Amino acid sequence: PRAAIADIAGHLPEQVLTNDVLAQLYPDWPAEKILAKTGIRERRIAAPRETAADLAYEAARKLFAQGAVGADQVDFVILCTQAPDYVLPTSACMLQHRLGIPTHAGALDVNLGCSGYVYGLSLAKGLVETGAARCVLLLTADTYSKYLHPLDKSVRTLFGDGASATAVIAEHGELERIGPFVFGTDGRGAPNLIVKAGLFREPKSADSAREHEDASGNVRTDEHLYMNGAEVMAFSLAEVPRAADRLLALAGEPRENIDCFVLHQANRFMLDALRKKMKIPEHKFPVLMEHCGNTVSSTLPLALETMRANGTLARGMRLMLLGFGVGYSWAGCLVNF
Amino acid sequence: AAHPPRAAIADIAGHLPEQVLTNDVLAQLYPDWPAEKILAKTGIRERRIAAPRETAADLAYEAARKLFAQGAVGADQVDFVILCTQAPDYVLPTSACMLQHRLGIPTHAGALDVNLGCSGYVYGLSLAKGLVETGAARCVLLLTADTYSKYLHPLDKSVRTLFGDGASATAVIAEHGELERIGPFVFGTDGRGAPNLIVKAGLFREPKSADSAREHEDASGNVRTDEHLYMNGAEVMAFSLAEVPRAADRLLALAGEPRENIDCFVLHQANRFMLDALRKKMKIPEHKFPVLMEHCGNTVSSTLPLALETMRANGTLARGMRLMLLGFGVGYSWAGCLVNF
User: Molecular function (GO) terms listed (chain A) (predicted)?
Assistant: First the structure.
């Protein structure tokens, strides 16, 4: 049995964070400058008590209307998120019931960020190709908005909330539909993208709530996300092209045979810099986050969904998916869609 | 000619923290619960407790160190890390990413955390088998670690007599042979069980509030707040008696495996009362049904690997033995698999 991506559905929340609203709040960053630097026109923001699991539920509901998978067919749920409902129970467990998925389905949460979709795909494929599941519902959902400091311009210009639902199912055929994979993990990158306080390394205290303004005027606490953009970019340029070359070597595949290199949609500056260093033509390199921003684990499936809708992704197309970010963590895989 | 890669358990190592919470100390804290009564009801004499700033990942780190010291695998061979925990270091980044680095594991290793509880090990095994047998990894380091102690209310007798902290490291490697060494699996999830085993407040569904810090006393005189673990023992027990025997039956049927061919039924080591009820309902003989948590208590995802480690230490687990592993708990979530050790 060969694992294949059967179908994808995305969901973005209602509230829009526009560049014009960010410009009102940050004088030094007008709409044209934010767009110039990031390529992001707007991000969607989850309602105040709307969680990542809620966005994933909506994504799954949308998926289940499309004609490839429904609740009754799901026999494993993987929720990739970095904003779960509880420390316990597992958010995927409640999504199982909420979606009407059968009680004989597996369910678990995975904590990864912008690498999470590719990793999720490797788990789903492992489950399908070992006969542990015939239909893995891979969910990604994030609400980074809930831990961005209001005066942290660097992250509020980038991050949007969102979710996706992908069905990975047992198919039969001669071609590998998902894989092979290359993985990466480098925990030295931890301090460059981190919410330091609020779980078990550092519980919340008087100190963790203490605000602190950086060189660029960005205010933060240990309870909010800290992103070292310069470090993350350095990491990305160092590791992603490397992983792409290694993945091609692993697969015995010339780079000309790849129809599309779909990268985690970090922002237009990062993607341009990666595209240039990777020598990939723009027509093989979608940049599709203008209206949703960086949705963390959902960037890839949202991109793929858009590509299907706009006619640029069709069955039999040879893709490279590349996810990279917080951890540090990164992963790539080939897909024969 | 050549045999496909088979995921097998190369080795297991456990780590428990230093501090011991004994029945005698519990009997001082809860005057109406003498040591002998705690023992009769739970079959647990001691639990280990993580130091105040020691996290589950820290415990996992030491389990992994001990595993490499046992010599079946080394850090340099690890190409994937799965940490199963419900007390991670941060909301982000992933605690597995930091363990990768701390353990000196190569950066081409995959790493991720899984949130599950007492079902976690069997689920973990399914993921590790998936990675190994699809060729995505040759040596998956499956870590379990929990520090439930950190969210037990001091006056919640029900949970404090049960739970211990701990971790384990399992090396799941590619063997090559005729026998499926890990699998098949049966899975279960039932989110209706959510309210019966839960830490309500502190993450994104219910942020901490004035009310979540308010203590309340329940029907049994146990005190907690919504920021602490709530466990409805009655419901969890009823769930366990309903699903675990069904899961076991379902698994054997799926595997075409007669019940008699299982050498050992290794169940999540919830406590003696639960395990006794399950053994009797499942009609399994005592010698095929280890109860091995007297000195560590219920260590959540680590119950199974710690039990397996103990069986190896005392010579009741050997290569070639046919096991059923059953994990079941918070979620609700449960899972079973067969193992040819």
Answer: 3-oxoacyl-[acyl-carrier-protein] synthase activity
Q: Resolution in angstroms for this experimental structure?
A: 2.1
At A269, the amino acid letter reads F
The answer to whether the CB atoms of B331 and A90 lie below 8 A apart is yes
Q: Which CATH number fits domain A177-337: 3.40.47.10, 3.40.50.300, 1.25.40.10, 1.10.10.10?
A: 3.40.47.10
The yes or no reply on domain B181-341 and CATH 3.30.230.40 is: no
Does A81 touch chain B if contact means CB atoms closer than 8 Å? no
Nearest CB partner across the interface for A195, out of B87, B92, B194:
B92
User: Are A53 and B205 an interchain contact pair (Cβ–Cβ within 8 Å)?
Assistant: yes
Same fold, A1-176 and A177-337: yes
Looking only at the bridges linking them, the beta strands covering B139-146 and B80-85 are parallel
Method: X-ray
Residue B207 CB coordination number (10 Å): 12
Q: Which residues in chain B have Cβ-Cβ distances shorter than 8 Å to A110?
A: 112-115
Using an 8 Å Cβ cutoff, are B191 and A97 in contact? yes
Residues A266/A269/A274/A277 CA torsion (nearest 10 deg): -170
Instruction: Report the distance separating Cα A120 and Cα A163, nearest Å.
Output: 14
Residue of A120, A70, A94, A121 lying closest to B333 (CA atoms): A94
Q: Does B280 touch chain A (CB under 8 A)?
A: no
Of A105, A185, A198, the CB nearest to B110: A185
Which tokens hold the place of A42?
A: 């707007």
| Alpha-helical runs (H) found in chain A | 19-25, 31-38, 52-63, 91-98, 116-129, 153-156, 229-251, 268-278, 299-309
Q: For residues A238 and A301, give the distance between their C-alpha atoms in angstroms, rounded to a whole number.
A: 24
Q: A258-292: b or e for each residue (b if 16 or more CB lie within 10 Å)?
A: bbbbbbbbbbbebbebbbeebebeeebbbbbbeeb
* Chain B contact probe: residue of A118, A127, A183 with most B CBs at under 10 A: A183
Q: Identify the CATH homologous superfamily for domain B1-180.
A: Thiolase/Chalcone synthase (3.40.47.10)
Distance from CA of B31 to the nearest CA of A (A): 30
Domain boundaries, chain B: 1-180, 181-341
CA separation (Å) from B146 to A85, A111, B150, B301? 18, 16, 9, 7
What is the phi/psi pair of residue B297, to 5°? 65, -165
State which fold the A1-176 domain adopts.
Peroxisomal Thiolase; Chain A, domain 1 (3.40.47)
Chain B touched by A196 (CB under 8 Å)? yes
CB contact at 8 A, A200 and B85: no
Q: How far apart are CA B299 and CA B84, in angstroms?
A: 12
Distance between CA atoms of residues A183 and B78, nearest Å: 12
Query: Which tokens go with A224?
Result: 């909010």
Are the beta carbons of A301 and A142 closer than 8 angstroms? no
